[PDB]
Amino acid sequence: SDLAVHRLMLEDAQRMSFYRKSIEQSASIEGKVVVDVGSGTGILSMWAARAGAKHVFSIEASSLSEFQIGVVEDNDLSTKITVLGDTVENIIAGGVANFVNRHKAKLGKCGVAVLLSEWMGFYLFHEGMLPSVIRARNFFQDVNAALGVLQPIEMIPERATVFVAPITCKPYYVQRYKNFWRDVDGLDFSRYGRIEYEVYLEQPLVECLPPLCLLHEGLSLIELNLSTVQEEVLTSLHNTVHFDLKESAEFQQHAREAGSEGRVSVDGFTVWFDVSYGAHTLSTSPRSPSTHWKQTTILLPREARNEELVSFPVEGGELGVEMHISASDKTLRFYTIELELK
Amino acid sequence: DLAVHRLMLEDAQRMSFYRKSIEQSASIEGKVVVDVGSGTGILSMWAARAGAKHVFSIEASSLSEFQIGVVEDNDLSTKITVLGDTVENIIAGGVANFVNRHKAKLGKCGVAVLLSEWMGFYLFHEGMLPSVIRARNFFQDVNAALGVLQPIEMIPERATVFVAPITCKPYYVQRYKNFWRDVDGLDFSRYGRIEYEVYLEQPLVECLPPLCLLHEGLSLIELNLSTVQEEVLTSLHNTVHFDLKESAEFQQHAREAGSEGRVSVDGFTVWFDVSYGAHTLSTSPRSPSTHWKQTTILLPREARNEELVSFPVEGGELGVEMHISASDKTLRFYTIELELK
Ligand SMILES: Nc1ncnc2c1ncn2[C@@H]1O[C@H](CSCC[C@H](N)C(=O)O)[C@@H](O)[C@H]1O
Ligand SMILES: Nc1ncnc2c1ncn2[C@@H]1O[C@H](CSCC[C@H](N)C(=O)O)[C@@H](O)[C@H]1O
């Protein structure tokens, strides 16, 4: 069932394709030393080896680490990949010198060139492992310093962005509920549709939203440089974005349906992320191919939704919002999304 | 919970069986129908569309209140009465009280047909059969009070539990080995065995590939829905004997095993059929998938991997005793136990 979740991630072709391409394009992998943080099945470790890495350290805390040793052996890669079955944090606690002392023969004169990881949670942050990736990065930079090696570590992915967009719920309601319930062998069961829908919204909605829900193409909220981001940043994630709904292609879709006296109402905001390396981008936008992340949608209170308290004339208007991504405890792995309209 | 109801309304097999039985039945038009556990009221509204004189729609949950609106939204309010109550509570009100409250709708003929979708997993588990039995008996008392002794037509009229021995290999191959064998040139097939084995130890409810059958299946338990009583649901067991020497399904695997070979048995799969007139609703692996899927009981992993239950390629005899036993007093929840011999 651990493996069932990993199988989900391995079936994510967009996810798989971004990492395979990024790894094959790095000029820092061949002949150099790679660390894979949170390696799971070891797929990224094994890709790095095939790409000609000198040696790979594959770090995995769970009991998958023991089976990964077997699969590495089954793929004849046991000399190029070392599995470390422990948390990043416990490896760190063992210290810089002890790391170098245990694996010096594999490190040789080279140090760590590349840090591979797939840490992204929902909107990058929620149920992710970014804080462990940051700790790993800082630790291996100290390991490099102790080896007298001064080259900075390549992060893959190297950059991450959070995107936000205002939505109307109508097309999600119509496509996922009303379309089915309105005609059940010629019977009108649409009253049941309103019910099923209203109660599912009172579950942070994590679902693949039809793109027609977008009232605007989306704006950047938070952007990260993965070589420089520090834990401190995860304590104050907030920004204010301004959606120009005038002359927005997305808004016009709905403006045409409203009629000349009609109004288009905002029911909430949907949130997604991109990460990138070199020429490659992995996107979880509703406009991109589906991924196991889907998107995360934050709704306005039902009072605001049903009475359409946030609405716009057919010509559009301006929509400002301040959004907070707030840690709900001290791990910085769990977050809540809070917003206030301008 | 309407999401579970959508799932049942999206089950094309389940829906066509009931739509066809109701629209092809000769006891509905001009007659009085009871829908026991009506939920959305689909079976009731179908009964009204088929020309029923009147329909009593019984639904215990708060769906009943919305069902009234939907009966109205489809212009059927004179033809369908929603009784938002448990079957058991309506019975407790007594016969004479029912007859007096609804005397004009019963008319002179009383209840002719009792519609219901009560089937759980392997017919019994998380099903609603005891309420259907109680309803049937109650409305036959109502009929008797009106001088009608004609027995009530049950839809479905019959139900059968089937069992068949299976091999796990094709399920392993199709749902595990095929994916894990090559992940971009990597052999992750070790992960495949682990995911598979660990999933088996967590009553397997799943769509088994038809190639898993070592035999077409035999009847374990058969019910006449006009006559079945609650007492029967406390002692459900039987013994079936599979002649694998005469099974086409076994011969299939015997050929793949080759002239020198053994065919191994990894467990038993259980499904059900219900029927009415010319129509059968089947949840067999050889039939289109339904939300019931099938239920599979595996032999101990020791037996499976050491192939402790096996047959030479010409076949042999496989006898098994099965118990379907209620795990509490509701007669809604059950476990399946089996012994080879
Ligand atoms: N602090 C930590 N130290 C070591 N492993 C960790 C960790 N936090 C999470 N993990 C592991 O990191 C993995 C992230 S899922 C990523 C799996 C794999 N790299 C892939 O791309 O397919 C999980 O297997 C989890 O067990
Ligand atoms: N003892 C009981 N008395 C009245 N309603 C019951 C009941 N037990 C279960 N129900 C209701 O019966 C329904 C059965 S599932 C819905 C069946 C519906 N006729 C269909 O074929 O789609 C559920 O809505 C449940 O709430």
DSSP string of A217-255, one letter each residue: --EEEEEEETTT--GGGGG-EEEEEEEE-TT-HHHHHHH
Which strand (E) or helix (H) includes residue B14? Answer: helix B12-24
Query: From the CB of residue A325, how many other CB atoms can be counted at a distance below 10 Å?
Result: 22
Backbone φ, ψ for residue A185 (5° rounding):
45, 50
Cβ-defined contact of A3 to B179 (cutoff 8 Å): no
Q: Quick one: CA torsion of B134, B235, B219, B202, rounded to 10 degrees? A: 100
Which strand (E) or helix (H) includes residue A58? Answer: strand A55-59
The token duo for B95 is 């016969």
Is A132 annotated as ligand-binding? yes
Question: After which residues are there C–N gaps above 2.5 Å in chain A?
Answer: 203
Are B80 and B55 in contact, with CB atoms under 8 Å apart?
Answer: yes
- DSSP secondary structure, B23-72, as one string: HH-SSSBTSEEEEET-TT-HHHHHHHHTTBSEEEEE--STHHHHHHHHHH
Is A338 annotated as ligand-binding? no
Which residues does B208 contact at the CB level (< 8 Å), separation at least 6?
A: B166, B171, B269, B285, B294, B296
Are B162 and B273 in contact, with CB atoms under 8 Å apart?
Answer: yes
Nearest by CB to residue B191, choosing from A3, A20, A187, is A3
Which residues does A26 contact at the CB level (< 8 Å), separation at least 6?
A: A51, A114, A154, A156, A277, A278
Closest chain A CA to residue B201: A1
d(CA B308, CA B166): 14
Stretch 177-216 of chain A: residues touching chain B, C-beta under 8 Å: 180-181, 184-185, 187-192, 195-196, 199-200
Which strand (E) or helix (H) includes residue A326? Answer: strand A318-327
Is A60 annotated as ligand-binding? yes
Q: Which atom of ligand 1 is nearest to the CA of A117?
A: 19
Burial (CB count within 10 angstroms: exposed 0-12, middle 13-18, buried 19+), residue A315: exposed
The strand pair at B334-340 and B317-326 is best described as antiparallel
Which amino acid, one-letter code, is at B259?
A: S
Cα A57 to chain centroid, rounded: 24
d(CA A75, CA A78): 8
CATH of the domain spanning A159-342: 2.70.160.11
Report CA(A152)–ligand 1 centroid distance (Å): 23
Burial (CB count within 10 angstroms: exposed 0-12, middle 13-18, buried 19+), residue A279: exposed
Nearest by CB to residue A195, choosing from B2, B194, B202, is B2
3-state secondary structure at position A170: helix
* Sign of the CA dihedral running B242, B247, B251, B253: negative
d(CA A94, CA A152): 22
Are A231 and B79 in contact, with CB atoms under 8 Å apart?
Answer: no
- Is the CB of A60 inside a 6 Å radius of any atom of ligand 1? yes
Which strand (E) or helix (H) includes residue B87? Answer: helix B87-92
Tell me, yes or no, if A74 comes closer than 8 A to chain B by beta carbon.
Answer: yes
d(CA B130, CA B329): 11
DSSP state of B289: P
d(CA B56, CA B44): 8
Are A174 and A135 in contact, with CB atoms under 8 Å apart?
Answer: no
d(CA B287, CA B291): 12
Locus of tokens 């949608």? A297
Peptide bond connecting B156 to the previous residue in cis, omega within 30 degrees of 0: yes
Q: Which atom of ligand 2 is nearest to the CA of B131?
A: 1
d(CA A129, CA A59): 13
3-state secondary structure at position A44: helix
- Is the CB of B61 inside a 6 Å radius of any atom of ligand 2? yes
DSSP state of B117: -
Closest chain A CA to residue B72: A188
d(CA A117, CA B84): 56
Q: How far apart are the first and last CA of chain B?
A: 43
Sheet of A335-341, strand order: A237-244, A318-327, A335-341
* Sign of the CA dihedral running B25, B29, B30, B32: positive
Report CA(A169)–ligand 2 centroid distance (Å): 31
What resolution does the deposited structure have, in angstroms? 2.4
Report CA(B89)–ligand 2 centroid distance (Å): 14
Are A340 and A322 in contact, with CB atoms under 8 Å apart?
Answer: yes
Which residues does A105 contact at the CB level (< 8 Å), separation at least 6?
A: none
Instruction: Please tell me the experimental approach by which this structure was elucidated.
Output: X-ray
- Is the CB of A9 inside a 6 Å radius of any atom of ligand 1? yes
Are A59 and A133 in contact, with CB atoms under 8 Å apart?
Answer: no
Locus of tokens 């809604």? B332
d(CA B277, CA B21): 7
Domain A1-157 in CATH 3.40.50.280: no
d(CA B95, CA B84): 17
- Is the CB of A131 inside a 6 Å radius of any atom of ligand 1? no
Peptide bond connecting A157 to the previous residue in cis, omega within 30 degrees of 0: yes
Longest dimension (CA), chain B: 77
Q: Ligand nearest A120 Cα, by number?
A: 1
Spell out the domain ranges in chain B.
1-156, 158-341
Bridge partners of B334? B326
User: Which one of 3.60.20.10, 3.40.50.11750, 3.40.50.150, 3.30.420.40 gives the CATH number of domain B1-156?
Assistant: 3.40.50.150
- Is the CB of A136 inside a 6 Å radius of any atom of ligand 1? no
Are B161 and B219 in contact, with CB atoms under 8 Å apart?
Answer: yes
Q: Which of A50, A185, A187, A196 to mutate to test the interface with B (most CBs of B within 10 A)?
A: A187
Which strand (E) or helix (H) includes residue B242? Answer: strand B236-243
Are B267 and B296 in contact, with CB atoms under 8 Å apart?
Answer: yes
Are B74 and B48 in contact, with CB atoms under 8 Å apart?
Answer: no
| Residue A20 with chain B: CB contacts under 8 Å | 184
Sheet of B236-243, strand order: B236-243, B317-326, B334-340
User: Which one of 2.70.160.11, 3.40.50.460, 1.20.810.10, 2.40.480.10 gives the CATH number of domain B158-341?
Assistant: 2.70.160.11
d(CA B99, CA A197): 39
Q: How far is CA B177 from CA A268, B172, B181, B266, in A?
A: 43, 6, 6, 17
Q: Give nearest CA residue, ligand 2 atom 12.
A: B37
The token duo for A301 is 């209170």
Closest C-alpha among A118, B330, B325 to residue B339: B325
